[PDB]
Amino acid sequence: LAPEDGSHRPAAEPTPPGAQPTAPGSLKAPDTRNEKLNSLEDVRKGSENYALTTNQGVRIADDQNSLRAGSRGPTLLEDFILREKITHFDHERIPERIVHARGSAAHGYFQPYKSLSDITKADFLSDPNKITPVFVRFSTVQGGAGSADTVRDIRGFATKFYTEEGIFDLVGNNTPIFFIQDAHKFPDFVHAVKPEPHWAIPQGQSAHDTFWDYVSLQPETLHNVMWAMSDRGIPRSYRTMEGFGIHTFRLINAEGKATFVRFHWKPLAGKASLVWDEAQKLTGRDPDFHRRELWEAIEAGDFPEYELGFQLIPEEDEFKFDFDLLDPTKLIPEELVPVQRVGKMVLNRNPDNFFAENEQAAFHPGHIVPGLDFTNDPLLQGRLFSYTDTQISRLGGPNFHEIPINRPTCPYHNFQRDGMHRMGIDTNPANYEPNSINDNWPRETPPGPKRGGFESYQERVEGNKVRERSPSFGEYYSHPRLFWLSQTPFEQRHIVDGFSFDLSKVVRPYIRERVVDQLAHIDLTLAQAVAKNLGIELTDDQLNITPPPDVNGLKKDPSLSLYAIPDGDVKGRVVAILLNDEVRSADLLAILKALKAKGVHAKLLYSRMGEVTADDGTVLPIAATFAGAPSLTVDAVIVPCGNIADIADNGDANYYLMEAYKHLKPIALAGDARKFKATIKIADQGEEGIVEADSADGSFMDELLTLMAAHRVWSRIPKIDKIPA
Amino acid sequence: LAPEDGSHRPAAEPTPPGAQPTAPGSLKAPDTRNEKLNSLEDVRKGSENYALTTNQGVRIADDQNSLRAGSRGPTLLEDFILREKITHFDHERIPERIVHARGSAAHGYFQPYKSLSDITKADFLSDPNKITPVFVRFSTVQGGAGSADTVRDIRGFATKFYTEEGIFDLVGNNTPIFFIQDAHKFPDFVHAVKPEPHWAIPQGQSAHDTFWDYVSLQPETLHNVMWAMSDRGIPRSYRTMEGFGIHTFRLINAEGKATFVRFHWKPLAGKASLVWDEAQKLTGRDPDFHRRELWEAIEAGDFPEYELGFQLIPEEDEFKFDFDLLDPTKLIPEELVPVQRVGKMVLNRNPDNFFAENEQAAFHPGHIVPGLDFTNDPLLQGRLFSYTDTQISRLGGPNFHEIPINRPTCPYHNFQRDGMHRMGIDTNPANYEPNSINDNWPRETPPGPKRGGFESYQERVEGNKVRERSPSFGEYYSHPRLFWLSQTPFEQRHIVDGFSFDLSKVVRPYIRERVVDQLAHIDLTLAQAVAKNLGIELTDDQLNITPPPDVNGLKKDPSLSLYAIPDGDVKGRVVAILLNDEVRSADLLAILKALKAKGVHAKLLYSRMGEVTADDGTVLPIAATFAGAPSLTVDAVIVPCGNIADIADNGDANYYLMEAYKHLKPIALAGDARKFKATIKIADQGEEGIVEADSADGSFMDELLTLMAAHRVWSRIPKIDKIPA
Ligand code: HDD
Ligand code: HDD
Secondary structure, three states: OOOOOOOOOOOOOOOOOOOOOOOOHHHHOOOOOOHHHHHHHHOOOOOOOOOOEOOOOOEOOOOOOOOEEOOOOOEOOOOHHHHHHHHHHHOOOOOOOOOOOOEEEEEEEEEEOOOOOOOOOOHHHOOOOOOEEEEEEEEOOOOOOOOOOOOOOOOEEEEEEEEOOEEEEEEEEOOOOOOOOOHHHHHHHHHHHOOOOOOOOOOOOOOOHHHHHHHHHOHHHHHHHHHHHOHHHOEOOHHHOOEEOOOOEEEEOOOOOEEEEEEEEEEOOOOOEOOHHHHHHHHHHOOOHHHHHHHHHHHHOOOOEEEEEEEEEEHHHOOOOOOOOOOOOOOOOOOOOOEEEEEEEEEEEOOOOHHHHHHOOOOOOOOOOOOEEOOOOHHHHHHHHHHHHHHHHHOOOOOHHHOHHHOOOOOOOOOOOOOOOOOOOOOOOOOOOOOOOOOOOOOOOOOOOOOOOOOOOOOOOOOOEEEOOOHHHOOOOHHHHHHHHHOOHHHHHHHHHHHHHHHHOOOOHHHHHHHHHHHHOOOHHHHHHHHHHOOOOOOHHHHOOOOOOOEOOEOOOHHHOOOOOOOOOOOOOEEEEEOOOOOOHHHHHHHHHHHHHOOOEEEEEEOOOOEEEOOOOOEEEOOEEOOOOOHHHOOEEEEOOOOOHHHHOOHHHHHHHHHHHHOOOOEEEEHHHHHHHHOOOOOOOOOOOEEEEOOOOOOHHHHHHHHHHOOOOHHHHHHHHOOOO | OOOOOOOOOOOOOOOOOOOOOOOOHHHHOOOOOOHHHHHHHHOOOOOOOOOOEOOOOOEOOOOOOOEEEOOOOOEOOOOHHHHHHHHHHHOOOOOOOOOOOOEEEEEEEEEEOOOOOOOOOOHHHOOOOOOEEEEEEEEOOOOOOOOOOOOOOOOEEEEEEEEOOEEEEEEEEOOOOOOOOOHHHHHHHHHHHOOOOOOOOOOOOOOOHHHHHHHHHOHHHHHHHHHHHOHHHOEOOHHHOOEEOOOOEEEEOOOOOEEEEEEEEEEOOOOOEOOHHHHHHHHHHOOOHHHHHHHHHHHOOOOOEEEEEEEEEEHHHOOOOOOOOOOOOOOOOOOOOOEEEEEEEEEEEOOOOHHHHHHOOOOOOOOOOOOEEOOOOHHHHHHHHHHHHHHHHHOOOOOHHHOHHHOOOOOOOOOOOOOOOOOOOOOOOOOOOOOOOOOOOOOOOOOOOOOOOOOOOOOOOOOOEEOOOOHHHOOOOHHHHHHHHHOOHHHHHHHHHHHHHHHHOOOOHHHHHHHHHHHHOOOHHHHHHHHHHOOOOOOHHHHOOOOOOOEOOEOOOHHHOOOOOOOOOOOOOEEEEEOOOOOOHHHHHHHHHHHHHOOOEEEEEEOOOOEEEOOOOOEEEOOEEOOOOOHHHOOEEEEOOOOOHHHHOOHHHHHHHHHHHHOOOOEEEEHHHHHHHHOOOOOOOOEOOEEEEOOOOHHHHHHHHHHHHOOOOHHHHHHHOOOOO
């Protein structure tokens, strides 16, 4: 059944996106190893050269047919082979996660830059030569496992560290705050953003009444709403967003000192987002774009890398800010508390089976290790309850830690027994302590500088038993205002556009008005611009609302913008090349090698599949058609010279350019490809963000790569409004 | 928290789409009832004027906060109010259906046109004035419960009939055959179409290697693949598709006579599908399009209506065709066996809670009633095992019939006891029979003409215990060819396009080639047109493969086409009206009056939200912006006159028309709106499919509504290649 030439099989070496069929990671990259990947070997199952069997090991002779009385007769109950095969199929599904149901995962490793023993006894942070295997799952939040990747939403960034002293799960998002203050409200907020209960619409979207109804009645939400309405809400890929733990946690060192910490992930590839029209159209054209992007970067060797960083605050400075450190709706500005680099995480192999490794992974922020501890952040405090509880249904019982991807790689022993799906066969004569019949093994371990038992930091607690929000949490507008003022002008316009779009889908007009009132508490310019888009007029009262105070003297912080401080990086990005039937082969040599030299991938597109032949007879393999792989999926578009008449009349080829133009992407036109300038209305003397020359040689590719480094051509935003695209 | 004017709350009368927020069915249409809807009253839970409580009935004072030791202190374990609330949240999800996970449902009623008691003793078909409540779920097949509606896929059409003599579930699809012959292969086929197991891509799409690998190796699949690749695979609405039971079943009359029968649903709104570009973009712009359209049609009074129809074959004619009646890859052409009309089904109320009624509903083709019976169809035979089995995990146990949506409205009594979540409290002293202690109640009932026990038709069985496919099943090409030749030239082109598009995404080129080889065994013109798009050249041998035989002398059957015989019905369709800031109210009057007379809905669109005022002071609320509700979501576009300069250079307004044009929709341009003819290159003297006049009037509306009756403008196809849209 395989073809003789063995081309059914992907090469076991790094290859760029689209070159080879994708594969299970252990087959694609058998030589990429780590302690966790190695320890999964006992459950990995081959196939080649094995007989097909039942689950009981009985070889199957005919897997095409049910047993029946007569070849046209009824199927017999004694067909155990049929019923086993159908039984397992009938029971394949398990409940999806209540939130972050949609997510894409990979294996990798972490290493600290230096020992952090002065501030934390955490073993995984003790030695730069200690490597910790990780498993990372990125996700959206609202939509089901089957929803689209490039929605507007918060993203989840969850890291499972398999340390020598326990599993540590760092379960964060791509924004430094959350929507709400106390975990008791999580079911209200989530129910409000999720599909509405009567009809289960809309999937993967905040643009509906219930969401904006809740936000309008709960101003503590406005901060994370600002983030989600910005281009933060539509990242280019999981490799180009930030990660944050949100909560203040504690580090505890061997001398018992507690230091407050907020965790950060910095993307080594830089920050980059889509624009809204492109993100939405991409949910239709490739609802798996981020999942795909991740898997292929790893197959290509473009491993996603992230730097772990810590904002660190002395215990004595707990009360030194305008906001409460325990309030998860407040960020800590980096101008006030810098991020200190701690180490590097590299994601470098895909899983083998998505269901087994990704769908069944269980992350929980209560999974800490000696050297870390909690705080009283009332959102974190409730999360600690939820993540253990939900697994009892999602993964079928209390033995979810024995599902292979979840297993510690370090020793685990205790007196816990039984439960559904129990794999470990305990030989301990004792199932209780204290016992004498096994000399009290396994034994408690006192806390200590290394390898000691967990002891909680002895924080003083003092108060009455109350259901009460701290008055210090009662401020809602200054952080939103701070984020707003830190954005570039084009970022601010995209925020205005995000609010305007979402609220336009709110059927009850009074809800729109109520959100607009809330915006007028943040910044009059924002509020007016959204109001104009909604045909709403601010009242004189709303026009006169005093802006909220700066945050400890800050009127902006540029670390809050995606783009204010360029951190571009082109490796792993992709360029569409629009071919014609007589391509100038010199243009193409110059184009492909320049891209290759910077780790930029290329996709050769035409009006059909198969091949075309260049001017000098080079045979050019076609990756996809113009309609099949639209500009949505690339970072820039290059048109080499040749017989342009071949495609000049192709509506798809023209539309390819107009869509890429509208979404602010670098375009380069060589030789007669400048005839396309008329489609995108480009002036004779040229325009910034359009590379043009007689040929693809000299500075042509360097100028294109310079545009790609800056991600998008923001200066084009005034010009795109005329284009009907 | 509600506004002053009561306008938080939807009018409880029929209203057009967008006029009111959508609502739970019993609040929207409280006067719409049937025996099943009434019987759900014991579990309906209101809310107005009630106190907020725990599930144990304890009133909550503060639903905003966890219990903590001091207002910035840790959350306490004794907070049972938080933990019940979070526990319930943490366990909301249940396993989605293995297949048909994505779906949308409604209540309604069925009734036969005349008594069928000469051919069946089934009670629900016995009396033209006896009404049977139904609950219908429409679905896709491949994607998850959060995947998009307007994918290319087969659709499911499952009807639960709550009869006086038992639940009958008629569990069909929107094409008259399935992909495979024997149930034993179902996990192989479904796994091949589903997302691939390494990376869980792609969602909701057949366009990937594993699917086309299976197809190319299993030519029995080609017939349903033809239907999937045609515009059947992308219906406009669940109201405008056909439904079929696929299998041959039996009708058994009071005298014991068996008649073989295939079941049909005929949509009274006519057959109508999208075009591919539109359908794929619509998965991004509104992934809930079909769910929404169905809910809104019901809210508006455009109740979906279907005619049940039977193809009837006497028992002595079982072998008289050149295909096997028991082969679910073969259709019975209506030219050979006509569909007899049987009754009418009306869907007239939406559910109250999607999860409780739609997600928990359980349909199963084994749920038959006396007067129906099965056949030896080897696909149907294995389905009977799977639907009972799968419910055990999906719905948590064997008491799934006690979940309120699934409960029979007729009596049910037996000796079965216990099981998880047992609701029924049995008083019977006996739990076994035979018993004396309850005088053997409840008792067996002998079979008879009405109110009788179920007895299987005593079919003769003769053969050895074999796992063997019937030789009569081993023909794969003649039904694909019949379907091909029965399609109009534009439908054939769209089929070619669908194959070409899917296969272009297959990475392994030998798989494309093998599928083209298969096409060459169906029809050369089809094989060559697919080959050309793939840059593949047919071999001499392939050009010489003899066409498969006609199906019992048939060279075409026009009933297999969506469009060859007009049957268009505009009621419930929708028109976009592109507003300007000085709308000519005389045009608007004439438009809305003619639309209203045919039950066609309108949406008023503009370049922002809020209101515009017409030339006569009429205040017009704006339903959506041009960008926010694209032409994808309407059936036609009208541009009234007025201040055209307002929108004449708006890129979104121009693009709206270019998109609707590309997708073959009727466009009407009044007065100066005729200037837009420029963006779409219409001849001065006009074009069939573009309605133009000095004003919108009687004749102008007529022309537009005639075009809408014909669904799309197929004659414009040659012209859409040039437009860059
Ligand atoms: C008390 C309820 C609750 C609250 C207040 C939070 N979550 Fe959570 N979260 C859950 C209850 C939960 C959960 C129900 O327990 C999930 C779903 C399924 C699972 O395994 O854990 C979950 C999943 C989940 C995942 C997916 C993990 C994975 O990939 O499997 C991420 C990344 C987060 N959450 C992160 C957050 C962040 C950054 C929060 C605010 C700071 C947050 N959660 C608040
Ligand atoms: C032997 C396995 C098997 C085979 C051969 C089939 N199916 Fe099936 N089908 C299932 C096993 C199944 C299932 C696993 O049992 C589902 C999923 C969960 C459930 O409740 O039923 C299902 C669900 C399902 C639904 C969704 C009902 C709902 O909305 O809940 C429809 C409409 C169909 N099927 C129709 C078909 C048709 C028309 C088939 C071929 C003629 C077919 N199935 C072959």
